[PDB]
Amino acid sequence: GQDLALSCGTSEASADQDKKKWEPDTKFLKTGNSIHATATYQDPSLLSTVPYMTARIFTAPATYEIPIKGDKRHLLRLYFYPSTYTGLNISNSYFTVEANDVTLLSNFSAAITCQALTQAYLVKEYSLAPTDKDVLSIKFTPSDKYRDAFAFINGIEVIQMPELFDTAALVGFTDQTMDAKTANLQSMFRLNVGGQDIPGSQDSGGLTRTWYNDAPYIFSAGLGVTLQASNNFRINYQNMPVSIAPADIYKTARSQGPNGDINLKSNLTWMFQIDKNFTYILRLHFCEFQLSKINQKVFNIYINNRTAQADTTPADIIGWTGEKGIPMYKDYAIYVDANNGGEEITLQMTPSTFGQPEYYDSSLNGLEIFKMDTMKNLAGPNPEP
Amino acid sequence: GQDLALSCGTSEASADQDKKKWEPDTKFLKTGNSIHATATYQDPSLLSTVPYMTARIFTAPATYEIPIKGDKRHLLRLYFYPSTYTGLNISNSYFTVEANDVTLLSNFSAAITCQALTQAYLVKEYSLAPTDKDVLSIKFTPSDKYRDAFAFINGIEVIQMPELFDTAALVGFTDQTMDAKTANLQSMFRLNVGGQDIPGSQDSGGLTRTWYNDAPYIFSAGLGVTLQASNNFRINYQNMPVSIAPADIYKTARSQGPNGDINLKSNLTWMFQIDKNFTYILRLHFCEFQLSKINQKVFNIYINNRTAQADTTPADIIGWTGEKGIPMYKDYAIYVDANNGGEEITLQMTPSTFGQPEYYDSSLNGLEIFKMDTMKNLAGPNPEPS
Ligand SMILES: *[C@@H]1O[C@H](CO[C@@H]2O[C@@H](C)[C@@H](O)[C@@H](O)[C@@H]2O)[C@@H](O[C@@H]2O[C@H](CO)[C@@H](O)[C@H](O)[C@H]2NC(C)=O)[C@H](O)[C@H]1NC(C)=O
Ligand SMILES: *[C@@H]1O[C@H](CO)[C@@H](O[C@@H]2O[C@H](CO)[C@@H](O)[C@H](O)[C@H]2NC(C)=O)[C@H](O)[C@H]1NC(C)=O
Ligand SMILES: *[C@@H]1O[C@H](CO)[C@@H](O[C@@H]2O[C@H](CO)[C@@H](O)[C@H](O)[C@H]2NC(C)=O)[C@H](O)[C@H]1NC(C)=O
Ligand SMILES: *[C@@H]1O[C@H](CO)[C@@H](O[C@@H]2O[C@H](CO)[C@@H](O)[C@H](O)[C@H]2NC(C)=O)[C@H](O)[C@H]1NC(C)=O
Ligand SMILES: *[C@@H]1O[C@H](CO)[C@@H](O[C@@H]2O[C@H](CO)[C@@H](O)[C@H](O)[C@H]2NC(C)=O)[C@H](O)[C@H]1NC(C)=O
Ligand SMILES: *[C@@H]1O[C@H](CO)[C@@H](O)[C@H](O)[C@H]1NC(C)=O
Ligand SMILES: [Ca+2]
Ligand SMILES: [Ca+2]
Ligand SMILES: [Ca+2]
Ligand SMILES: [Ca+2]
């Protein structure tokens, strides 16, 4: 059927602020008796009125049927703008969303979730494994616990993507590995480390992912030192698919800085709020654009205080890639529960004292955090405040 | 083993006018020698320079090896743009193409085929039955009969597809069928009847098939009346796979029109140039979007002057589907013989008088014509020049 950007509750085509074209959802909606509504407040923080200002509202289970290619992986995005739609209190909305037998959301309150994030809108993004079916059935089910619950949706995107997931190294364990090839994933965070926001229009692979500056997630007292590649520095992908990440991710990084003695005394630390009781994959993106040789910059990486790369196998970007300007990533997996970090993921970097490196520093170019499904479920609870 | 769109002779990723992404063919070329070439001339009829303006040229045999799932059916497309490449005379190009054990093309002249069609480029499309092999070997062999014979290719696509083929009713016989489930097929024609061209980007199943307007193929004096479903009319597929055809096929149709007297005195007639000595499957796509009951519109269907639906079993779309808005298709098979049939398939419809229907009309929403393989061969001769 091909990729779609549906603005729910619209009757004509529309375009957003980033030159993405959207179309009405009506075509794809199997079930009747939905309500369409336009919000009566346009939050000044919205980047566009599209798709956010218009919604479709469901008071019974409702299914969209989107033609897809069965053998392919897809990105699915759900856009929500909890605002005022004439005649409803958005606080009453609690619902489930499923996509071909994968549960995405359950008892989901967009209002509570937005309040907790201090953001007026939400985009939930998922990477769905191939389901061998030529229709993606997206079912919205109002809560059967609350008589007054309704479901709503402002936009849906379905985007074919390559098989960009394979194995991840298990954090804190010696050489253990797990397969992500058939996993369903939720995108939790996607950062351009040390660099400016990259809008979807500048993403690679036609995937229109947004990559956010990482500064708001730095937990260490030190912000470190951001690095920028020289003008027209060439990112040499070699055999890495360009869809993994756009070149600009690799042209900037965050490092600890030029003072190796100070760097040895601290970790550069990021912290993220996530849902308990899931395995997460952290994809760390690297590209050395300053140094040229093995054993110049060699560093330990820790996830939730456990070893990701350390001891006699620390991280060395040139050690991994063989050459300045080659991009790469490494995937690490951690099951996060009460004993392992609770509701938080921490990522920490510090120089290694193995093999007498030329410098004592660390760096990172990009970061993605994905939730893996457990028994075809990705739904977590709503956040607190 | 993913789907591929290879633009042969390129060294950078490219994209065409319909946003299809293409990549270089280099990694998949397994045996032989070849060079990249760029066409000297951009024909104004080309929608894109991708993949058509670049080619790989073979002066001896060469093979691609493409990873596939052996238990799955595939679409294979071969793109050709005859032009002057590396100083060679395109009129000397005659070659064979094989995909595993299936001969697709033999003594193939892209130049002559293009001249006969009044088209500057060709896309040959095949549906290959499961191979039980994890590699698709695509072999290009220059003709060993002409001395300066060479082969060329501009683009290759390999696309995993569902099993969209089963049995077809043999025309002019009753309860005799042809089995296409494990056949290798060539796509000859694919039409949105009564509607505008549907580009591959809008095709269902992610199969990127183009559905072309049918008007050029009508040979009755009357072109009938084209119909379009109302705004927000929904096509209700039920258990028919959406990969069969996109919704827009079913939202338009060609009919004979509102004058039943005129309709009763004529056939709506399509004609197609094909290759003799093959069995063809005609897939007729239907969806009733105006009427609502059985025995409102009831019509006879003839293929090569023989009965496909007639007598006491004429076509009735609601009769078949049970409801307005439910799409369907019916497959019919016909052998086109070396004398009778004579390089053409004709499809004709006219109203039936059987059972006193409310109206006297006929309609059709889409049409596909497939060649079935014989002796593991789908190759036909080059058409006559004019
Ligand atoms: C296509 O098939 C014909 C044979 O067709 C069969 O035999 C015929 C004699 C007739 O009985 C048909 O109805 C049968 O289906 C191949 O042979 C040619 O056939 C034509 C007449 O149809 C005849 O004029 C030629 O002399 C025959 N040729 C030879 C070499 O004997 C023909 O070669 C086949 N073509 C292809 C491209 O495979
Ligand atoms: C950098 O962070 C790592 C990981 O959190 C620190 O190592 C941990 O230190 C605590 C003690 O404070 C121990 O309980 C853990 O066992 C350590 N983990 C590992 C994997 O060794 C490390 O000390 C920090 N370094 C600095 C300089 O702050
Ligand atoms: C559905 O979601 C809300 C989450 O916000 C749940 O209600 C909250 O539950 C927690 C206790 O875990 C309290 O701290 C909050 O005060 C509750 N908030 C509100 C607004 O009621 C609710 O329990 C969930 N329901 C189900 C069936 O899971
Ligand atoms: C519509 O076309 C059909 C099929 O070509 C016509 O039926 C044929 O008529 C010719 C001449 O009368 C015969 O040689 C064929 O044997 C007929 N075939 C069949 C299957 O009946 C039919 O006459 C045409 N209808 C109209 C209304 O013109
Ligand atoms: C290969 O194809 C060419 C072109 O179709 C064939 O040559 C034509 O043969 C027919 C006779 O069947 C004549 O009508 C044309 O004048 C010929 N055209 C040219 C350009 O020569 C040729 O016979 C075929 N060769 C083989 C071995 O099958
Ligand atoms: C997490 O898992 C533990 C252990 O299975 C369980 O006791 C707890 O209820 C779960 N908590 C959440 C928030 O899912
Ligand atoms: Ca909307
Ligand atoms: Ca960066
Ligand atoms: Ca090409
Ligand atoms: Ca049509």
Author numbering:
A (entry chain B): 26 to 410
B (entry chain A): 26 to 411
Give sentences copied directly from the paper behind this entry:
Members of the plant-specific Catharanthus roseus receptor kinase 1-like (CrRLK1L) family are key players in monitoring the cell-wall status and regulating cell expansion. Loss of FER function impairs pollen-tube reception, whereas ANX1/2, together with BUPS1/2, helps to maintain pollen-tube integrity during polarized tip growth, assuring fertilization.
We crystallized ANX1 in space group P1 with two protein molecules per asymmetric unit. We determined the structure of ANX1 via single isomorphous replacement using a platinum derivative. The structures of ANX1 and ANX2 were refined to 1.48 and 1.1 Å resolution, respectively, with residues 26–411 in ANX1 and 28–411 in ANX2 being well defined in electron density. In the case of ANX1 the crystals from both studies were isomorphous (r.m.s.d. of 0.6 Å over 382 corresponding Cα atoms) and grew in similar conditions, with our crystals diffracting to higher resolution (1.48 Å). We next explored other potential carbohydrate-binding surfaces: Structural alignment of the bacterial CBM22 (DALI Z-score 8.6) with ANX1 mal-N brings the xylotetraose ligand of CBM22 into close proximity to the distal face of the β-sandwich domain normally used by B-type CBMs for the recognition of carbo­hydrate polymers. We located three and four well defined N-glycans in our high-resolution ANX1 and ANX2 structures, respectively.
